[PDB]
Amino acid sequence: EGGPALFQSDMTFKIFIDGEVNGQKFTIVADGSSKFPHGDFNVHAVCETGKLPMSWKPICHLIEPFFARYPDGISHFAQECFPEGLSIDRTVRFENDGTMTSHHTYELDDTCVVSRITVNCDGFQPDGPIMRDQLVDILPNETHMFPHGPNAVRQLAFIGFTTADGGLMMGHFDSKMTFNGSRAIEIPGPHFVTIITKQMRDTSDKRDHVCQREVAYAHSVPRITSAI
Amino acid sequence: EGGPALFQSDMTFKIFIDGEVNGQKFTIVADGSSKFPHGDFNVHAVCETGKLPMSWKPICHLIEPFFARYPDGISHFAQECFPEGLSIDRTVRFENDGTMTSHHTYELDDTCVVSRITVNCDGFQPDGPIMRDQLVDILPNETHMFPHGPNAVRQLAFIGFTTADGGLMMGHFDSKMTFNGSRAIEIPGPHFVTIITKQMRDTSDKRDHVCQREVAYAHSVPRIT
Ligand code: NA
Ligand code: NA
């Protein structure tokens, strides 16, 4: 198409995140592999600035939409964007807490996808559960994909995180993916991507790091053909 | 006898809506029925005041969470609320347009659930697709249900409506359902309700007559173990 044809290969990825939270700079490098048919892959992410100043949990969406698994009959926008690439502009606004704003660029180097992300995490509560590292898991969710003009798609999500006291920190996620090239590209109709995420810490790597697994896949719902 | 045991049969409902959009007052009355196991049901609505002064599409969510079909390992909060009843306080904020704020109460009379709702639709664009009636389809959604303390559940959704010119009007839906009793109630863990809606214009004359069908069912999504 021929972006989806490229993704019939096994691929690797590398992510460079330049971040700040409340004025304190951080750097994360991440890398991984994803074999066809994709939709289930791990990432190894390391904080290169010593110790991450906030919970690793909200970093989950920063550390590969083209590795989601799409069925027959839904257009896979992120994959169609290649070989030219795509950018992402994203907001995650946490209730009673700060807002993460990011800019993502993706380029293809043969079968490696290289990602550069700058993120500003501002207005975060120093005595809240993100900065106190009191977030215990990431709730699986049904993200909503929408056409967004001729060259973009918008992803909306409610991303929950369970707190150590058994409460819930809710992030309002709004992400626009934009095609970088001049050709016309097939914009999918409204659909969903289900995303399941889990982070783990091992003795393997001694650096501050997570190993995160994501299962991601697209689906539609049966439409109803009359009101009887 | 309480909760889901009250919903094992065929049931009816009646809805009274007291509304305004940009200060224009309107009244809707609606009824329908829902047969066990529920999850697929019709409503028939009439604007008692004549012509609806806005699109009927954003009214879809006002004109029955207890008629969603719940499977066996998810507690069906809205059913569990009965006989005491349930309230809903809900906002739907539309991008580049108005906000609908509604307050619902639900009461069970035998096998009929009666609903009384006030809605305030404020700040709507007189030249936007809501007020100009240029919304065509209601997109299906995956609404997100969360526990919300020991007596409530919060439902979050992205409710989109396509416009005639192929655009999208997006509503941010935020809704709290609260038990009005003193008994301890089981609060379900995080889950989803899939909702598929279709609205039909009916033979009207003096009053708008609209029919709506909704398929709604709960499901809960993998975890990684
Ligand atoms: Na499509
Ligand atoms: Na449950």
Q: What CATH number corresponds to the domain at position B213?
A: 2.40.155.10
Distance from CA of B60 to the nearest CA of A (A): 13
Specify the 3-state DSSP secondary structure of B23: coil
Which residues make Cβ contacts (< 8 Å) with residue B23, sequence separation at least 6?
none
Residue B199 belongs to domain spanning:
1-225
CA B22 from centre of chain: 21
The single residue listed with the structure tokens 């906000």 is B99
Closest by Cα among A83, A67, A87, A77 to A13: A67
For A5, which DSSP code? H
Polymer length in residues for chain A: 228
Q: How far is A203 from A91, CA to CA, in rounded Å?
A: 33
Pull the structure tokens for residue A183. Answer: 């050709």
Amino acid at A175: S
Of A146, A170, A222, the CB nearest to B168: A146
What are B71's two structure tokens? 């499977």
How far is the C-alpha of B92 from the C-alpha of B174, rounded, in Å? Answer: 6
Distance (Å, whole) CA A120 – CA B221? 31
Burial A172-192 (b: 16+ CB within 10 A, else e): bbebbbbbeeeeebebbebbb
The answer to whether the beta carbons of residues A104 and A117 sit under 8 Å apart is yes
User: Pick from B73, B205, B96, B65: which is nearest to B161 by CA?
Assistant: B96
Please give the tally of structural domains in chain B: 1
Cα A214 to the center of its chain, rounded Å: 9
Q: Decide if B181 contacts B33 (C-beta within 8 A).
A: no
- How far CA A131 is from CA of A21, A200, B31, in Å, comes to 9, 19, 50
Could you give the dihedral angle defined by the CA atoms of residues B164, B166, B172 and B176, in that order, rounded to the nearest 10 degrees? Answer: 60
Question: Is B42 touching A (CB cutoff 8 A)?
Answer: yes
CB B31 within 8 A of CB B44: yes
Cα separation, A93 vs A121, whole angstroms: 10
Element (H, E) at A20: strand A11-21
Cβ neighbours for A127, distance < 8 A, ≥ 6 positions apart: none
Q: Contact, B209 vs B203, CB < 8 A? A: yes
Residue B167's alpha-carbon distances to A53, A150, A224, B134, B135, in angstroms, are 41, 11, 21, 10, 9
Chain B within 8 Å of A190 (Cβ-Cβ)? yes
- Distance, in Å, from the CA atom of A77 to the CA atom of A179, rounded to the nearest integer, reads 9
Q: How far apart are CA B155 and CA B147, in angstroms?
A: 9
Chain A residues touching residue B190 (CB < 8 angstroms):
139, 160
**Cβ contact, residue pair B213, A196, below 8 Å:** no
**Closest residue by Cα to residue B97 from B125, B56, B120:** B125
Given in angstroms, what resolution was this structure solved at?
Answer: 2.0
The DSSP symbol for B69 reads B
Where are any strands of DSSP class E within B35-81?
40-47
Alpha-carbon distance of B215 to B38, in angstroms, equals: 9
Rounded CA separation B8/B34 (Å) = 11
For residue B187, the 8-state DSSP code is: P
Partnered with residue B156 across adjacent β-strands are B144, B174
What are A150's strand-pairing partners? none
Asked if residue B157 lies in contact with residue B141, where contact means CB atoms within 8 angstroms, the answer is yes
